[model samples]
Structure formats: structure tokens, C-alpha cells
Target: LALRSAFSLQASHVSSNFHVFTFITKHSSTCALTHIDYASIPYLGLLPTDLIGKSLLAFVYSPDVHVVRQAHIDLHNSRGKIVKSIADLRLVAHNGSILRCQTEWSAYVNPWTRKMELVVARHRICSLPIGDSDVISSPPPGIQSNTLPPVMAKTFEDELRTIMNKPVP
Candidate 1:
């Protein structure tokens, strides 16, 4: 039996220090952005209202967009067997700049032990990179402090599992 699945995020407290960015993408015909943490508001120049209900590729840079799409497809193609998937890609900011990020898509298994078909990305913002028009620029390396604390994701996974267990709304 496929029990219900759920994912909850730290609404406010955790947003301040790490610029924590996360995504809850549900499989509804096509993958959809059900919820997103607005941790990138300041740097991305985009509010939460700007991102919800959008396809994953809309804000992704053109060159690497294919990779993002592949990640989504491959996850499902594996039939939920892959628990942790990593993708390194660039996200487009509101002001038209790009933020390089690494997204770790963690698959949650329901108590019945079936993969829930939803994705809760363990997201991290790497850097706000300068534009590359003529290949004259190399992007800055991310500082060590920008990544999430190792223990933080366990809480998020728990929240996601809680959501997964609930009956659909």
C-alpha cells in the first residue's frame, strides 16, 4: 500500500544563516513545484510567489537545463530505487544573474516501504557567479560556510516523511 507522504520545512529560523534553499516537487502528471523555501530571495531577487507552480527548467540556465530534466526523469526511471541523487547546475536569479547550486534529491520511502514518488531536494546555494559572455571569466569558489550543517538534513527528511504519511488534502 502507498501510504500518504508529506514534507515540512523550517519556515523562518533556519533561513537566516545558511541561506537554506529547498524544494518539494510532487509527481502530478508532470513534476511540479509544490513548495519552495525562499532562502534565495535576497540574492536571486525572486520571491516565493515568483517560483511556485513553475517547471524546474524555467529558471535553470539554458546549457545545463537538460541535466536538471535528466535528474527528474532518471530518478523516476530508476523506479525510486535511487535514494540519493546529486546534480550540479545553475539557477537563474530574478535579476537575470545565475546562482550555481548543488541539489541532492533524496527519495523518501513510506512506512509501507514503497518509494513515494515525491522529491525533497537537499538544496544548497554555491555562489552568485558573474556572467560569462566571452569565456573571459571564471566563477568564484564557494566558501565552506555556505553548505548546510551535516546534521540539518536529517530533520528535513523527518519532516518530509511526516508529510508523506498524511492523507492527501
Candidate 2:
């Protein structure tokens, strides 16, 4: 059975000693933000193996939390090349009222029991000055937008799909 999956992040600036917290949740195809989770997988941009009680170094915290979102999972028989069972999440716009922005990610269930290490990612966006552009566009393009470049989104999905099909010991 699939259970609820969650993620959180924290940022501390050494010079100013300021800290920022952010949490992410997914429920029925929607995302909500809350307090941060300090002791989660991939702590402070380092994998669990690399973060073992490491002290904080010089860091500058971005005031913006960026994005917080989750995906829904489905399990099925393997198809050899493609991942038959996978969880996919769509990146949508996060209004200023929200603590984070919208990001795209995909997760697959590894055959390894209880070692469900899921990977998530955020897409890069290209923004142009409204006054500087000859086209004079309004607002920047999003991940899944026709107006935006397709390289990043395609790379993320294709790479993740490849990782999902590998045999797990």
C-alpha cells in the first residue's frame, strides 16, 4: 500500500545567523506549505550518507523558499523499457501568498523492499524583462508551458524514467 510522503527544508545564514523554514505536503492532488522538517532525507542539499552530523558552514539563505510540492504514486507490472509504476507531479504556479514556488518531479517505486528512496526535482525558468524584450511578454514562462523551453522538463522526465526501470537488489 502507498502511504503519505513528505519533505521539508531549512536555511541558516552564518554571517547574520538567520534561519528560514519550509515544509511540503501533497493531499488529493493539491499542495500545502507548513513548518520545516530539519531531519528529513537529503538534508541541507546533502545526501543522508554525506550529512552525518556535519556542522553548518558559511551559508546565505535565500529569502524565497522556492517551491514545495508532492506527487501521487501508482504501481503496476514492469514494461521492460519504461517504468510501469510511477508517481508524477505537475509543476504549477505558486502565488506570492504561498511560501514556495511550483516545481515538477517524478518518483518511481524501486523493487527494493522498504528502501523507497524517491527523487524529486525542480525545473528552471527563464525570465525576461518586460520592458527589455522586443516581444514585450507578460510574466515568465513556466515548466510545462509551450512558451517556455522544453529541454529541462524533457531531461528531468527522461532521466527519471530511466532510473525507475533499473533492477533493485
Clashes of 1: 6
Q: What is the lDDT of residue 137 in candidate 1?
A: 25
**Model 2 accuracy (lDDT, Cα):** 0.24
- Tens-digit lDDT string for candidate 2 (47-162): 23332321111010122211111122221122121222122222222110111223344333444442224433332222211122222122244422321133543433343334
* lDDT (CA) per prediction: 0.46, 0.24
Itemize residue pairs with steric clashes in candidate 2.
Answer: 66-101, 67-101
**TM-score against native, each model:** 0.51, 0.24
State the displacement of the C-alpha of residue 19, model 2, in Å, after optimal TM-score superposition.
5.8
C-alpha RMSD for every candidate: 14.9, 16.2
How many collisions per candidate?
6, 2
- Worst 10-residue lDDT window for candidate 1 reads 1-10
Candidate 1's TM-score reads 0.51
